[PDB]
């Protein structure tokens, strides 16, 4: 059901990174399901451009698109609900 009821609108993420480390402002989701970021491996794709051995931090929310950022570097987040912020 969590795969079958998945909406498809795909809004472009409003993310700001920072070398101080990212924050995304998304529309009101209206559900307590936390938007979570994680590491994915650089093999999977649709046409698979070569020369991939890297990892990417992708943060998926339900109604906000998966804000992805490759991490070439070699419970630590936050979800503020009154201003619609993820970090």
């Amino acid at each position: 059901e969590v795969k079958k009821f998945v909406k498809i609108g795909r809004p472009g993420y409003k993310v700001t990174k920072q070398r101080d480390l990212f924050q995304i402002d998304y529309p009101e989701i209206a559900e307590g399901i936390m938007p979570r970021h994680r590491f994915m491996s650089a093999y999977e794709q649709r046409i698979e451009p070569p020369d991939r051995r890297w990892q990417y931090l992708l943060m998926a929310a339900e109604p906000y698109e998966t804000i992805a950022f490759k991490v070439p570097s070699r419970f630590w987040t936050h979800w503020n609900r009154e201003t619609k912020q993820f970090f």
Binding site: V2, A60, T66
Partner: protein
Amino acid sequence: PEVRNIVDKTASFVARNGPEFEARIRQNEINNPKFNFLNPNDPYHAYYRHKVSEFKEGKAQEPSSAFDLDVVKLTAQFVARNGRQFLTQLMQKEQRNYQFDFLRPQHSLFNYFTKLVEQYTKILIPPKGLFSKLKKEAENPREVLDQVCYRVEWAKFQERERKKEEEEKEKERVAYAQIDWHDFVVV
């Protein structure tokens, strides 16, 4: 912006009063080109048609170790009589050429010394036994029963909240076992 404000106003109006209000506007002012934005003839028709539902949903911007135990207890007691966080008998007692190996915050026994100090400071409050008398818990099985029932009820409420949190955590694990892993796009 005249026509823009007109469309936004018709949008607020229709979102408030209903699509029959749009019928009212159209049928009252079909003879003025101001409500053509309610009719298919004015190119702002669909724009206002969207803004209606948008201002209805709330998105658009409105117009504008006994010796060690004895030592730990003695430390809690002798710190019960200090005056501030730096004004005790332990600040200089550390450098007083006598081993005091519990005051360091990396040693977990600092938590045991802090718990002994908490017990001493909860017994050295005015209700701890300095100049007052406890009589509701000391001859009152009714007050004791009220407190026991309140503790059991707080425990039940804490367990119920914990179960809600655990169901949320299992739902989060299930929602992570179902996330998008092919619609990858970096901004």
